[PDB]
Amino acid sequence: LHKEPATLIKAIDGDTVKLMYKGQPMTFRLLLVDTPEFNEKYGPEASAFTKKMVENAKKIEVEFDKGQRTDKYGRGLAYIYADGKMVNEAKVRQGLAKVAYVYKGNNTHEQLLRKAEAQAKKEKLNIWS
Ligand SMILES: Cc1cn([C@H]2C[C@H](OP(=O)(O)O)[C@@H](COP(=O)(O)O)O2)c(=O)[nH]c1=O
Ligand SMILES: [Ca+2]
């Protein structure tokens, strides 16, 4: 895969970010993850962690997978990096999201994320406690 530049417009919530990609505003849904809704347990915690990761970053990057790049709602589908650290992976790694929505063709980082979730469990970290 390959990374592309982008800039933050707005950190919406756990699983979505609005970015300027190719000079155009676009909302991205993070691939391979499901964050607890704002009103569920760990929701506000999961949300802050995500927001701050993209807001504190000096450089945001977009990385599409080998399949569809947009979902049915018109959201871009990608792995997002903050100063070279993958946001999708970091969220799962700290027990603030679960690997989910693994679709044929967009699963390049599936095993890396599942290892992060296994590691987060070994520690009953956040959502695993
Ligand atoms: C992450 C992801 C979500 N989706 C769709 C499936 C779900 O459809 P439904 O709206 O019918 O449930 C929806 C959930 O995204 P959210 O978890 O943001 O709500 O987004 C994809 O199609 N591909 C993806 O890679
Ligand atoms: Ca969600």
UniProtKB/Swiss-Prot annotation:
Instruction: List where in the cell it is found.
Output: Secreted
Where, by residue number, is the active site?
R29, E37, R75
Quote the protein name from its UniProt record.
Nuclease A
* Intrachain disulfide bonds: none
Lineage top rank: taxon:
Bacteria
Please give the residue ranges the record annotates as the region Disordered. Answer: 109-129
Q: Where does Ca(2+) bind?
A: D15, D34, T35
Source organism: Staphylococcus aureus
Basic and acidic residues: bias regions: 109-125
